Motif scaffolding. Structure first.
Motif, short mmCIF file in Angstrom:
data_model
loop_
_atom_site.label_atom_id
_atom_site.label_comp_id
_atom_site.label_asym_id
_atom_site.label_seq_id
_atom_site.Cartn_x
_atom_site.Cartn_y
_atom_site.Cartn_z
N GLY A 190 1.72 1.87 -11.40
CA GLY A 190 0.59 1.65 -10.99
C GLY A 190 0.78 1.27 -9.41
N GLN A 191 -0.39 1.49 -8.33
CA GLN A 191 -0.40 1.01 -6.74
C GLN A 191 -0.62 -0.22 -6.52
OE1 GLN A 191 0.01 1.25 -3.35
NE2 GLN A 191 -1.67 0.39 -3.75
N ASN A 249 -4.31 11.15 4.05
CA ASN A 249 -5.34 11.83 3.02
C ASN A 249 -4.97 12.89 1.98
OD1 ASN A 249 -7.92 11.75 5.18
ND2 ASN A 249 -6.32 12.91 6.51
N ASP A 250 -3.92 12.31 1.70
CA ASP A 250 -3.18 12.58 0.48
C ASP A 250 -3.81 11.70 -0.79
OD1 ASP A 250 -1.53 15.01 0.78
OD2 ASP A 250 0.02 13.37 1.74
N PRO A 251 -4.45 12.19 -2.26
CA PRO A 251 -4.31 10.45 -2.93
C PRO A 251 -3.89 9.77 -3.06
CG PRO A 251 -4.87 13.41 -3.39
CD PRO A 251 -3.94 13.33 -2.45
N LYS A 252 -4.15 9.20 -3.46
CA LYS A 252 -3.24 7.51 -3.77
C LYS A 252 -4.18 6.79 -5.34
CE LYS A 252 -2.01 5.11 -0.36
NZ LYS A 252 -1.85 4.31 0.66
N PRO A 253 -3.26 7.35 -6.65
CA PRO A 253 -4.12 6.83 -7.60
C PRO A 253 -3.91 5.52 -7.43
CG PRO A 253 -3.47 9.24 -8.07
CD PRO A 253 -3.12 8.31 -6.79
N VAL A 254 -5.31 5.42 -8.42
CA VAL A 254 -4.50 3.49 -9.08
C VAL A 254 -3.63 3.46 -10.10
CG1 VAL A 254 -5.56 1.23 -10.34
CG2 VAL A 254 -6.88 2.91 -8.57
N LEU A 255 -4.22 4.33 -11.10
CA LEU A 255 -3.05 4.61 -12.26
C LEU A 255 -2.83 6.52 -12.56
CD1 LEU A 255 -1.69 1.92 -13.85
CD2 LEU A 255 -3.34 3.28 -15.63
N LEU A 256 -1.09 6.12 -12.78
CA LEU A 256 -0.94 7.48 -13.56
C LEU A 256 0.07 7.58 -14.61
CD1 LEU A 256 -0.58 7.68 -9.76
CD2 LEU A 256 0.50 9.95 -10.55
N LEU A 257 0.40 8.05 -16.03
CA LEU A 257 1.38 8.41 -16.64
C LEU A 257 1.79 9.60 -16.75
CD1 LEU A 257 -2.29 6.58 -17.34
CD2 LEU A 257 -0.68 6.05 -19.62
N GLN A 258 2.98 8.83 -17.16
CA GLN A 258 3.90 10.24 -17.40
C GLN A 258 4.64 10.60 -19.08
OE1 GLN A 258 5.60 12.54 -14.48
NE2 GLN A 258 7.42 12.89 -15.54
N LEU A 259 4.37 10.93 -19.50
CA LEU A 259 4.38 11.17 -21.76
C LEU A 259 5.53 12.29 -21.24
CD1 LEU A 259 3.56 9.29 -24.00
CD2 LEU A 259 1.91 11.69 -23.85
N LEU A 261 0.84 -1.16 0.04
CA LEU A 261 0.35 0.26 -0.07
C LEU A 261 1.34 1.57 0.33
CD1 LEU A 261 -2.67 -1.86 2.00
CD2 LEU A 261 -2.97 -0.55 -0.36
N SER A 262 2.18 1.36 -0.05
CA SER A 262 3.22 2.13 0.32
C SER A 262 4.14 2.22 -1.03
CB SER A 262 4.19 2.05 0.93
OG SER A 262 3.19 2.98 2.69
N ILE A 263 3.45 1.66 -2.08
CA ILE A 263 4.30 1.55 -3.26
C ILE A 263 4.08 1.41 -4.25
CG2 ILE A 263 5.76 -0.94 -4.59
CD1 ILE A 263 6.45 -1.52 -1.62
N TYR A 264 4.50 2.05 -5.59
CA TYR A 264 3.74 2.08 -7.24
C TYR A 264 4.96 1.64 -8.14
CZ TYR A 264 0.47 5.13 -6.82
OH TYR A 264 -1.13 6.22 -5.64
N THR A 265 4.29 0.43 -8.84
CA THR A 265 5.29 -0.31 -9.84
C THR A 265 5.38 0.71 -10.79
OG1 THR A 265 4.72 -2.20 -9.54
CG2 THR A 265 5.55 -2.48 -11.21
N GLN A 266 7.31 1.02 -11.58
CA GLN A 266 6.61 2.01 -12.53
C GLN A 266 7.57 1.47 -13.58
OE1 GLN A 266 9.95 4.14 -10.53
NE2 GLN A 266 8.15 5.62 -10.11
N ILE A 267 6.86 1.32 -14.87
CA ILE A 267 7.40 1.07 -15.99
C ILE A 267 8.17 2.29 -17.49
CG2 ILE A 267 5.56 0.03 -17.51
CD1 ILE A 267 8.99 -1.24 -17.16
#
Ligand SMILES: CC(C)(COP(=O)(O)OP(=O)(O)OC[C@H]1O[C@@H](n2cnc3c(N)ncnc32)[C@H](O)[C@@H]1OP(=O)(O)O)[C@@H](O)C(=O)NCCC(=O)NCCS
Ligand SMILES: C=C(C)CC(=O)O[C@H]1C[C@@]2(COC(C)=O)[C@@H](C=C1C)O[C@@H]1[C@H](O)[C@@H](OC(C)=O)[C@@]2(C)[C@]12CO2
Ligand SMILES: [Ca+2]
Ligand SMILES: [Ca+2]
Length: 435
Positions: free
Chosen positions: A149-150, A126-136, A16-22
């Motif tokens: 991805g959360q 109380n800070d947002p934790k989105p399911v999926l984020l993208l950077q272009l 719950l503290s980790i974002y997977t990045q690719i």
């Protein structure tokens, strides 16, 4: 319009503290294409969110108190997964810089290429934790797309499935009946709970209880892997039967890392290998299930035993734990135990791992990211890398397997282990240092 409880197994406070990045890298012939690439992704994002609203959601943890680590669920946030557009052309990596150095980990700073960090350090329950984020990202001569991805919401298999569907949505292809089903599978039902169950030794590895280091990519040619696999096959068991390329490569790294660690640890030092396993197959769940459905296999030995045994003996240790009845049982036992546990503080997939002597490996070899073009008109990715984050000794990944069969391992080790490995004659016969 949605309130989706996470996979019981994904309710681990570490996940719950980790974002997977690719990151997917593409060449861009002309900058006039950039605005078109952005518009195409924006529209795929809308199309995906219309069929599957929850992808645009956020993770919220309810009912926290002393003695209760809470229960997490996916709830509404924005209309689409948040997209950041970052122009690095104005010093950032360039396509030519990336090509000449071999797309090294050095040049994939998560701070530069990713919309959020891997680890929950700095800002921002109380800070947002989105399911999926993208950077272009716009780079000179190219384009880096990074997807976050959360981890309680998805493992990398599930993230890849979602990414595959975003690619379809981006070229305006409709989703199949099968894909709609998988995306909509009840997460609560996916691992059946055990009717009568009391925790015992089977959950030991998942219940418990910093030295100067770096990250580096290493590459393995189809030919080096073929020779590795043969040399494991040539020294098998023989309870099994067979070993895979992935088995052999994992075994070669445990042996090689063990070997170099003999310069700094007793021969009889305990070594644990933790290896991630997609649980979708063994559970009888669609490979396209987007959730978190993962476990690990655990392998205890000693540094000297692992270094000095035949490769086939090491690879066999690994293959032997893939027994489907055993994987299912261990996973269902975990799910049952956690379901009934209000305080999930002692639960972790790497609970008994020692950074000094363990290995914690996740093979992304099977993820299909080398195939997605996103209607961008740029062809398929030239590179698929996992961005660099803080050094994390003994943590390792295999990248998605290049269409030509090349493997790359992202490896974190303390400096003296790293330098001894890089200088190791048997290691460098098969492994090429990229950095
Ligand atoms: C456990 C895992 C790593 C093993 O991967 P794998 O060994 O490549 O895949 P499988 O166990 O399905 O075996 C397929 C391989 O075994 C071979 N094989 C399968 N059955 C065989 C048999 N009966 N006889 C001979 N060979 C056989 C196949 O030919 C293939 O080998 P190859 O890749 O060398 O060509 C993988 O299944 C996995 O779960 N990966 C995901 C890990 C994860 O969750 N990470 C994400 C982090 S969020
Ligand atoms: C900092 C932590 C919470 C522990 C850790 O090692 O984390 C790794 C391992 C892991 C998650 O670990 C835990 C304890 O949940 C994930 C991501 C990270 C940063 O990568 C890989 C994978 O996605 C996870 O499963 C994971 C176990 C991994 C190594 O196999
Ligand atoms: Ca334990
Ligand atoms: Ca123990």
């Amino acid at each position: 319009s949605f309130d989706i409880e996470l996979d019981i197994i994904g309710q681990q406070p570490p996940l719950l503290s980790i974002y997977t990045q690719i990151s997917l890298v593409y060449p861009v012939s002309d900058p006039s294409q950039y605005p078109t690439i952005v518009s195409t992704l924006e529209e795929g994002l809308k199309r995906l969110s219309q069929t599957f609203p929850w992808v645009a959601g956020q993770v919220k943890t309810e009912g926290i108190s002393e003695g209760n680590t809470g229960t997490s669920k996916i709830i509404p946030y924005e209309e689409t997964p948040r997209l950041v557009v970052k122009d690095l052309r104005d010093s950032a990596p360039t396509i030519e810089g990336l090509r000449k150095a071999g797309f090294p980990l050095e040049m994939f700073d998560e701070n530069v290429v990713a919309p959020r960090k891997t680890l929950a350090i700095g800002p921002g329950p109380n800070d947002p934790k989105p399911v999926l984020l993208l950077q272009l990202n716009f780079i000179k001569g190219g384009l880096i797309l990074t997807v976050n991805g959360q981890h309680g919401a998805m493992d990398m298999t599930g993230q890849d499935a979602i990414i595959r569907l975003l690619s379809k949505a981006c070229r305006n292809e409709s989703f199949t009946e099968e894909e709609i089903s998988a995306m909509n599978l009840d997460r609560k039902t996916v691992v059946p709970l055990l009717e009568n169950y009391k925790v015992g030794p089977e959950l030991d590895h998942q219940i418990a209880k910093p030295a100067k280091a770096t990250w580096a990519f290493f590459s393995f040619t189809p030919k080096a892997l073929s020779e590795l696999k043969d040399a494991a096959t040539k020294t098998l068991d023989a309870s099994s039967k067979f070993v895979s390329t992935d088995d052999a490569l994992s075994a070669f790294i445990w042996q090689s890392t063990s070997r170099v660690r003999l310069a700094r640890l007793d021969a009889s030092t305990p070594t644990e290998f933790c290896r991630a396993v997609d649980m979708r197959g063994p559970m009888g769940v669609s490979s396209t299930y987007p959730g978190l459905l993962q476990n690990m296999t655990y392998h205890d030995s000693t540094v000297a035993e692992i270094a000095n045994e035949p490769l086939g003996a090491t690879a066999s240790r690994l293959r032997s734990e893939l027994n489907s009845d055993r994987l299912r049982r261990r996973t269902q036992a975990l799910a049952t135990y956690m379901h009934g546990l209000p305080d999930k503080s002692s639960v972790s997939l790497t609970a008994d791992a020692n950074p000094s002597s363990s290995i914690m490996l996740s093979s992304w070899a099977k993820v299909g990211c080398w195939e997605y073009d996103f209607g961008f008109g740029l062809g398929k990715p030239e590179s698929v890398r996992r961005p660099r984050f803080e050094p994390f000794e003994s943590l390792m990944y295999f990248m998605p397997k290049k269409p030509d069969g090349e493997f790359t391992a992202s490896i974190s080790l303390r400096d003296e282990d790293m330098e001894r490995l890089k200088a190791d004659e048997e290691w460098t016969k098969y492994a090429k240092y990229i950095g």
